[PDB]
Design an enzyme around this catalytic site. Structure first.
Site, short mmCIF file in Angstrom:
data_model
loop_
_atom_site.label_atom_id
_atom_site.label_comp_id
_atom_site.label_asym_id
_atom_site.label_seq_id
_atom_site.Cartn_x
_atom_site.Cartn_y
_atom_site.Cartn_z
N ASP C 45 77.02 34.09 -13.32
CA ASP C 45 76.41 33.83 -11.87
C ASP C 45 74.54 33.61 -12.30
O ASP C 45 74.30 32.75 -11.49
CB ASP C 45 76.44 34.87 -10.85
N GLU C 117 68.95 34.60 -2.34
CA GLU C 117 67.91 35.44 -1.47
C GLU C 117 66.66 35.15 -1.91
O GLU C 117 66.24 34.74 -3.15
CB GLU C 117 68.25 37.16 -1.33
N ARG C 142 56.51 48.47 7.67
CA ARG C 142 55.85 49.28 6.62
C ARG C 142 56.97 49.87 5.62
O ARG C 142 57.84 50.57 6.15
CB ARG C 142 54.94 50.33 7.08
N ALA C 156 74.98 39.97 -2.96
CA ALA C 156 74.02 40.16 -3.98
C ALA C 156 73.35 41.43 -3.71
O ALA C 156 73.49 42.56 -3.25
CB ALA C 156 73.43 39.15 -4.75
N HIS C 217 66.36 34.45 -9.25
CA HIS C 217 65.71 35.01 -10.38
C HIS C 217 64.20 34.96 -10.45
O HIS C 217 63.39 35.87 -11.09
CB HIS C 217 66.58 34.48 -11.61
C1 LIG Z 1 76.05 39.69 -10.55
C2 LIG Z 1 74.82 38.65 -10.30
N1 LIG Z 1 74.89 37.94 -9.17
C3 LIG Z 1 74.28 36.97 -8.78
BR1 LIG Z 1 73.08 35.98 -10.20
N2 LIG Z 1 74.60 36.18 -7.67
C4 LIG Z 1 75.51 37.35 -7.08
C5 LIG Z 1 76.09 37.13 -5.96
N3 LIG Z 1 76.05 36.05 -5.15
N4 LIG Z 1 76.98 38.09 -5.61
C6 LIG Z 1 77.18 39.06 -6.57
N5 LIG Z 1 76.46 39.12 -7.73
C7 LIG Z 1 75.52 38.26 -8.08
#
Ligand SMILES: CCn1c(Br)nc2c(N)ncnc21
Ligand SMILES: CCn1c(Br)nc2c(N)ncnc21
Ligand SMILES: CCn1c(Br)nc2c(N)ncnc21
Ligand SMILES: CCn1c(Br)nc2c(N)ncnc21
Lengths: 258, 258, 258, 258
Positions: C45, C117, C142, C156, C217
């Site tokens: 991914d 995200e 906070r 994720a 990232h």
């Molecule tokens: C394993 C690292 N990873 C990444 Br990069 N995107 C995702 C995602 N959308 N869902 C789950 N895991 C993720």
């Protein structure tokens, strides 16, 4: 030594029990299910729980051992293939002790002993209780219910409610919430609470006075309740240990990988 | 008795400090910030934390007191209006002690003492460590980081991570997770873990060996780390208590209503 | 059709890429990494994420496909053994589209696009921001930070923070908290918040104005920030789908069992 | 316009109802509790819920309004002091609509409509169901039970279970877990799941086939259940709105500060 063996009642466990009884006959061991000093449970943790509650009037006289014929259990932590070795050493071991939870229910008194946990829910409608800690009003809880767990019980219902796992050498009890209502009007602590020995947690009704109270597997409806009182029991359960099987390793084996 | 007073440094706290110093002059009390036996903190819990770490080499010789000029604090639990009464009784009290957390970092050794907690995060990229409990490999943690809390520290960062609050009479430490990754491949326990005295929790790197380690307010970057080792300290912090202010009441006052 | 292929860069992925290129040569397909219409990612991914961000200026012109040479991925959801079949059908498929998240940062403007995200943490010390929803002051947060997730991003980082998984057909964004401080003085909602299209969530500093902002990232330090603004993007990522691989089945395969 | 008014039944609400009826008499409004086009609830959200379920056979013909004589409610979001102004504009407003949840129970069919949520627990003993999503087996759930919430219902039971709050303009339903058992043997997703329109979530028994099913306030025991089926209803509840009272402001007022 007097001994007795309870079985889950399936084919696997009954045949293992009869074989251990036969093995015990080859030594000087008398089967007595009235005043045993050794209580062997064959099955799962629920089989062990029933064994504990069958003899909770003689906890100081008994050492418990659990054999799991299914998956790895937290109390039944011997494999069936080791039953012969168990019979050998059982006929002459050191003992380890775990704390227990005392529940007292008052009306207008009944006391219970728990190895895992004691929970309170409402029977008729919404659950509202005042939580009193050492005579100090701590909170008014509104939600599904509450759970007070022993140390070894923290891996059971307590864990599913978000509670912490704590090593059974710590003489404590842990209170966790069940779906609490929190807004600007109603406020609970949210976090699990860990209480030491001699601390008393008291639940006192606000409107409804009927509660469904559970103690391990046993769940009883109580009517016209005035108080529910929790504290760490003075009594302990004694295990017969023959090898090092650390609690944290049992936790790893049950939840991480085995 | 020798004594000293630290201040938050705003107008409120400095003027309260000068008044208490003047009050202490009317007795037989010598101001000494080198070898005090009484350390008074005026401000908040952060002011108290700095006071603790200023004199952590003489913990066995000192009794601490906290005065909160702002909101109610867990260590600074005296009101400013009671400062005169504090001066009175301080010149001749019983002492209460709370456990502490020992952190040891090894390279290719540095030890720290925490009153609240010690956390570990990654500096360069993803955080992956092997968690070892009493030399037993327990889990491979992947996430944002980990937090090990003292009993009195459970109301601080530990609470925001979902940990349990535990009474400070329990000699224990609590490990909580920070945003762990859990799938079919990567598995952590999830639940907070409560460890007793003499249990050693060790973190060991997998790939990256640089970590941001925090101890209370202090946060230091460490490079080429071989091991991070946690255990309940042999040392304790001593408080001067003059009245009954129970921990669970302090918890209620801070989180439920005051 | 123009096409290009990015690789994780290990032996497995590079050799799979060279074989697919050779397979594409046996058809009428021109390799172009400047204006491709098909972008094939081989790896995981993270490899797919980099591929998305390499060509985020031509999202409307491209259909993405992911091949996972390691474990099952949520975007790279083709097995390497199916690469030949992929080459076949790719040379003449229907397209599916997932929503994206727009982040706008203002100083004394920079906009970013996220597939998973966008998070905000503090650089120097404590993180305090005012959360404004459609110009309405909602809360003063906070804690450690905040995370705004796309629908496909919910599996994720959003998942590790307790957020809900939502099907990617829903045009929405989800905000989750990172270790919030909640007492009688400081109050956050706690729950994840799911916002529809055209809703604007704005973060506004209180004291410190420097923030570490991450977008997938990519993590950049921003100084003298006046506002961070989130909304569902008008742009979407287009996938090339050749078979039914439902989102909920991908969720099952990744977290329950595969 | 035909209209009717339900009351909580205390002195405050009954007297407010009689005053509004008198106010409506000064216009051309006919009181009809059989075929009203306007249904006014005076009391709390529970009073509003009963009003909704009294007339759920004519949802397309009715606009609802709620007056809260106690604390601020999510459906009863008019103050009693504004009742006169309400009567004025009600006699000639725009309508807003919120999605609803359809529950279908099959035996060896009964359908229900929920404004907040629909929950399933076990009657006799342990709760074990297979969760099927669009005919795809997703998980085997073991725990206390499950909760499927509407968007506006997310602030109610769904919130206490850790679910996300979602804006009611999103046509979706959210499934949350109640104290799930998770170990190496039993695995659930844990996270809340948000489903769009036309997705069908089906619960299918494993051993026991008796379940306690709740729909808003109504809780019924069902025996010999073969399937429980959830989906977003085709029907919607219509509100009469006279001013801008945004959902996120109602959330702030109820949980942050008012
Ligand atoms: C394993 C690292 N990873 C990444 Br990069 N995107 C995702 C995602 N959308 N869902 C789950 N895991 C993720
Ligand atoms: C599997 C059922 N079970 C019982 Br009974 N007791 C426990 C326990 N202490 N920890 C985990 N699981 C348990
Ligand atoms: C308000 C900052 N703070 C500090 Br510093 N220590 C603590 C603590 N032990 N509990 C709660 N809050 C704390
Ligand atoms: C106070 C009881 N209550 C009812 Br009834 N419905 C709701 C709701 N949707 N959100 C919050 N609270 C509610």
């Amino acid at each position: 030594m007097k001994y007795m063996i309870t079985s889950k009642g399936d084919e696997k466990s009954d045949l293992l029990r009869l074989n251990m009884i036969a093995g015990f006959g080859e030594y000087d061991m008398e089967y007595d299910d009235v005043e045993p000093e050794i209580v062997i449970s064959i099955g799962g943790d629920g089989t062990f729980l029933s064994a504990f509650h069958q003899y909770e009037e003689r906890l100081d006289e008994i050492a418990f051992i659990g054999i799991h014929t299914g998956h790895l259990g937290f109390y039944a932590d011997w494999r069936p293939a080791e039953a012969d070795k168990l019979v050998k050493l059982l006929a002459k071991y050191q003992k380890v002790s775990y704390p227990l939870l005392k529940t007292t229910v008052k009306y207008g008194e009944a006391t219970y002993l728990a190895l895992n946990e004691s929970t309170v829910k409402s029977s008729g409608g919404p659950f509202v209780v005042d939580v009193v800690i050492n005579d100090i009003h701590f909170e008014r809880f509104r939600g599904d219910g509450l759970c007070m767990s022993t140390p070894s019980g923290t891996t059971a219902y307590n864990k599913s409610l978000g509670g912490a796992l704590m090593h059974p050498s710590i003489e404590a009890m842990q209170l966790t919430e069940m779906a609490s209502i929190n807004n600007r009007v109603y406020r609970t602590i949210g976090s699990p609470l860990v209480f030491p020995k001699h601390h008393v947690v008291s639940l006192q009704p606000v409107n409804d006075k009927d509660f469904q109270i559970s103690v391990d597997h046993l769940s009883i409806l109580h009517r016209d309740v005035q108080e529910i009182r929790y504290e760490v029991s003075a009594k302990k359960i004694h295990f017969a240990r023959f090898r090092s099987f650390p609690f944290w390793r049992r936790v790893h084996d049950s939840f991480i990988e085995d």
